[PDB]
């Protein structure tokens, strides 16, 4: 492919021997999740993100699938793969570094970062919808749209990441994958459709408006998607749930974003808008 093949020794060298201590303590660990750990590295005179993968053949399939999707899909709102390593004792994927990490971490202000403004949140929602539109236009279903998989660059531009479970309505699967707090009912039953990505994006829009995680075991409701029912049954208002860590949110645009989220979250897959309609509505909002 057009990607660089890196030596495992070069990647081990540039991540301080895959130093598992967090970056805040002087180590190289930036994150963990998606079948591996992500480390900060320095190749040539550039900061990079090195994901070290850790079923053996199931992990190799995710490695191959990510490379395949990345070779085909290049867009301003998608992460960029620079290279890979498959020669040492572990599989590695090398990406262009995202200085502002994930939307999940910026919404929680992890490591003391300042709360995102409403202006920045609108740009992020638009950017993420543009990335999903590119994936759907190129006949790919992400299957794990969530705030942890929306990364933020040096200008807080939204970049969709983690295409290891992406698939090139309609199709069924015996291996149900995804993150339960973001999954559409039909996705939880094994259906594979881009309509499920829309539902997950609706949960992301609620996270952007409220600053709350999609699931919190010590919260009522535990699942963020359940606030749609509280608002519909007039028990609460969207105003009650707006993230208090903002000083520039205006009711009109917050209600406009909530209307998009509510439409995405329709329980019936055929009643949800498609990604092009979601993009149009988010563009009209600003």
Ligand X SMILES: CC(C)(O)CCn1cc2cc(NC(=O)c3cccc(C(F)(F)F)n3)c(C(C)(C)O)cc2n1
Q: Is 144 a catalytic residue?
A: yes
Q: According to the annotation, is 149 in a ligand binding site?
A: yes
Q: According to the annotation, is 146 in a ligand binding site?
A: yes
Q: Report the residue number whose CB is nearest to ligand X.
A: 31
In the bound complex, what is the minimum distance in angstroms from residue 93's beta carbon to ligand X?
7
| Candidates 105, 144, 197, 243; catalytic one | 144
Please choose, from the candidates 262, 246, 207, 251, the residue with its C-alpha nearest in 3D space to the C-alpha of residue 119: 246
Q: According to the annotation, is 26 in a ligand binding site?
A: no
CA pair distance 233, 76, nearest whole angstrom: 39
In the bound complex, what is the minimum distance in angstroms from residue 268's beta carbon to ligand X?
32
In the bound complex, what is the minimum distance in angstroms from residue 136's beta carbon to ligand X?
20
- Residues just before a chain gap in the chain (C–N exceeding 2.5 Å) are 54, 168
- Closest to ligand X by CB, 106 vs 136, is 106
- Closest to ligand X by CB, 84 vs 118, is 84
| Angstrom distances, CA of residue 32 to CA of 3, 28, 94, 267 | 23, 12, 15, 31
- Closest to ligand X by CB, 160 vs 257, is 160
Q: According to the annotation, is 50 in a ligand binding site?
A: no
Q: According to the annotation, is 31 in a ligand binding site?
A: yes
- Closest to ligand X by CB, 70 vs 257, is 70
In sequence order, what DSSP letters do the residues of 58-120 get, joined into one string?
HHHHHHHHHHHHHHH---TTB--EEEEE-SSSS-EEEEE--TT-BHHHHHTTGGGPPPPPHHH
- Closest to ligand X by CB, 121 vs 272, is 121
In the bound complex, what is the minimum distance in angstroms from residue 161's beta carbon to ligand X?
4
Please give the residue ranges that form the binding site for ligand X (CB under 6 A). Answer: 30-31, 38, 49, 51, 79, 95, 97-102, 111, 113, 151, 161-162
In the bound complex, what is the minimum distance in angstroms from residue 247's beta carbon to ligand X?
20
CB-CB contact of 250 with 258 (8 Å): no
CA pair distance 184, 148, nearest whole angstrom: 17
CA pair distance 275, 178, nearest whole angstrom: 19
CB-CB contact of 209 with 220 (8 Å): no
Q: According to the annotation, is 85 in a ligand binding site?
A: no
CA pair distance 4, 270, nearest whole angstrom: 42
Q: Per the annotation, where are the binding residues?
A: 30-38, 51, 146-149, 162
Catalytic machinery residues: 144
Q: Per the annotation, where are the binding residues for ATP?
A: 30-38, 51, 146-149, 162
């Amino acid at each position: 492919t057009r990607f660089h093949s890196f030596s495992f020794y070069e990647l081990k060298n540039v991540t301080n021997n895959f130093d598992e201590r967090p970056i805040s303590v002087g180590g190289n660990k930036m994150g963990e999740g998606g079948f591996g750990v992500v480390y900060k590295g320095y190749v040539n005179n550039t900061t990079v993100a090195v994901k070290k993968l850790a079923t053996t053949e199931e992990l190799k399939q995710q490695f191959d699938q990510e490379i395949k999707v990345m070779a085909k899909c290049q867009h301003e709102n998608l992460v960029e793969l620079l290279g890979f390593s498959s020669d040492g004792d572990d599989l590695c994927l090398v990406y262009v570094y995202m200085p502002n990490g994930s939307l999940l971490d910026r919404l929680s202000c992890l490591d003391g970062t300042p709360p995102l403004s409403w202006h920045m949140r609108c740009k992020i929602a638009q950017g993420a919808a543009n990335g999903i539109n590119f994936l759907h236009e190129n006949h790919h279903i992400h299957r794990d749209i969530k705030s942890a998989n929306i990364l933020l660059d040096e200008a807080f531009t939204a970049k969709i990441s983690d295409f290891g479970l992406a698939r090139a309505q309609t199709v069924m699967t015996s291996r149900i994958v995804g993150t339960t707090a973001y999954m559409a009912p039909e996705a939880l039953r094994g259906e594979i459709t881009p309509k499920s990505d829309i539902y997950s994006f609706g949960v992301v829009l609620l996270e952007i408006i409220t600053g709350l995680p999609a699931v919190d075991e010590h919260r009522e409701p535990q699942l963020l998607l359940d606030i749609k029912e509280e608002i519909e049954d007039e028990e609460k208002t969207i105003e009650d749930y707006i993230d208090k860590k903002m000083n520039d949110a205006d009711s009109t645009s917050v209600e406009a974003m909530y209307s998009v989220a509510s439409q995405c979250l329709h329980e019936k897959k055929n009643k949800r808008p498609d990604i092009k309609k979601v993009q149009q509505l988010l563009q009209e909002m600003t």
